[PDB]
Design a protein around this ligand. Sequence first.
Ligand SMILES: [Fe+3]
Ligand SMILES: [Fe+3]
Lengths: 256, 256
Amino acid sequence: ATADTSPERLAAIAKDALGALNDVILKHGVTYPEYRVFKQWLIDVGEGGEWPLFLDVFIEHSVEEVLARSRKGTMGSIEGPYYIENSPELPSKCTDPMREEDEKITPLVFSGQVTDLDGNGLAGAKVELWHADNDGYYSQFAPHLPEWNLRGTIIADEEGRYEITTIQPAPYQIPTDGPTGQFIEAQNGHPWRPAHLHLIVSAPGKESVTTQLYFKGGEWIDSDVASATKPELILDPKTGDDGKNYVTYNFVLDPA
Amino acid sequence: ATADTSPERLAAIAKDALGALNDVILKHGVTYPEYRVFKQWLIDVGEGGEWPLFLDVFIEHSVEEVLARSRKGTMGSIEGPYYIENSPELPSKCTDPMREEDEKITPLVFSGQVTDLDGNGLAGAKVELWHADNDGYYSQFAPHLPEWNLRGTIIADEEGRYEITTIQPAPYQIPTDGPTGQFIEAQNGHPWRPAHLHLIVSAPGKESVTTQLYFKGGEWIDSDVASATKPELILDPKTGDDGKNYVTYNFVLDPA
Ligand SMILES: [Fe+3]
Ligand SMILES: [Fe+3]
C-alpha cells in the first residue's frame, strides 16, 4: 500500500492525532497501570492478527465519511476486512454460489439498475457482492466454507440491470475471542453489526462505489458497532407468495 | 499488567479517543490510500517489536503529565522502555559498572541527597540509575554489552546522601531501521533525545519517583523527540581540574 502523502502532510496529521490522544489521557487522568494494560493490548492486537478487524470496525467509517464528501451518487459504506477480488463472474440474472445448508435459508431476490447521476442506465456495469452466511461466516475467512460461498461479480445487462438471488443475511457478530472482543466486552459494549450485504459497483468512466445494504427493522440497525449504517442504505424487502424476499435498489455512480 | 478500570471508565476513554482520531481523519481528509498505509504500519510496529519504543516516545509523556498533577516533590519524567529491576546494589559512594571502553569517556560525578518535602534527609533511600553508553546502547538491549553496564541501585547513606560516578551521557538516537524510524523519517522529524540519565528514587514511606536528568546547553534539549525534558531536570555540571564533570542534584519525595 502506498499513498501520495508529503512529509509536511504526515507531520500535521501525526501532530493532531498524537496531540488528541494526549489530550484524552489528560482529560481522563489515564494512570500508569492503565498505560501498561493499553501497551499490552496493542501488542496483543498485532499478535492476534486483528489490525484489519479492529480498524475497520472503529476507524474505517471516518475514512468513508471523508470520501463521501466528494460524492453525489449512492451512499458508500465501509469495505470491512473480507472483500476478495476476482470473485467468479455471473450473468445479470443469477444466483450466488451457495451450499446445500444455505438453500435452507429464506431467499433474497435483489433487483435494480446501475445508473449515472441523471438516472441513465449504464452499460459495462458490474456488481460485486459478498456477505456472511446464516452462521456469521465469510468464505475465505472460515476453513469449512467453499471459497466463493456467497460471493460473485454480477455482470449487469446492456441497460445496467441485475437480478441477484442469495440468502437473507442475518445479524453479524464480530469475532470475540481476540483482543478486539476483549476490548468490547471490557466496556459492556455490543459486538454486533446489523445484517448486511457488501457491494462494490463499478462502470466504465465511473468512480466505483463500495457500500452495504441493510434491512428495515433489523436487529442492531440503530446500534452498529462499526458505526457504518446509513438511513439511505436500508432496504425494505417484500415477501412474495413463494416465501422469498424481494427488493429493488438502484446504484447511481459518480463520474471518474 | 492489570488496572482497576471500570467498563464505564473504559467506555468513556475509548469514546473520546476514537472520536478524536475520527475528528483528525475528517479534519485532514485522510484518504483510502493513506488509511491502507496506516493499517500496514500498525501491523509493522507489532511485527517489529516496537510498541514499547513507539509508545514511550510519543505517548508516555502525557501519562507522566497526569501523574505530575498529584506530586509536589521532584519533577518526574518518562521511564522509557529500558528500565530493569534488581540492578546490583552499590554503596552510597560508588561508581557504576562499566567497560574499559567506557573508562575512555569524561567521567560524571553525581552527588546529592534524597529528602522529604521539607528537606529532611531520608534514611533507607535508594537511587536506581541507568543510562546509555557513548555509542547510544543500553545494556540488556544490546547483545555486546555486559548486562549491568551503566546500571545500579545506589544505597544512599543514613542522611540520604549519594556520590555516584559514571560516564557523561551523550545524545541518544532512537532506533531508526524499524517502523518508528520510518514514521519519523517520513515527516522529516528528528529521531533524537538529549543526553540523559534515567533514575528511580525511592524511600520507605515515600512515593518513588521515576525521572531523568539532562545537561545545560546539550544538543536536542529544546527538541526532544519524546517531549520528556523539563527545565527543572537540567543539570549544569562544573568541570574540575581532574577533567571530571561534577554536579549535585537533590531528590525530594512525596509521601506514599
Ligand atoms: Fe460484513
Ligand atoms: Fe533513555
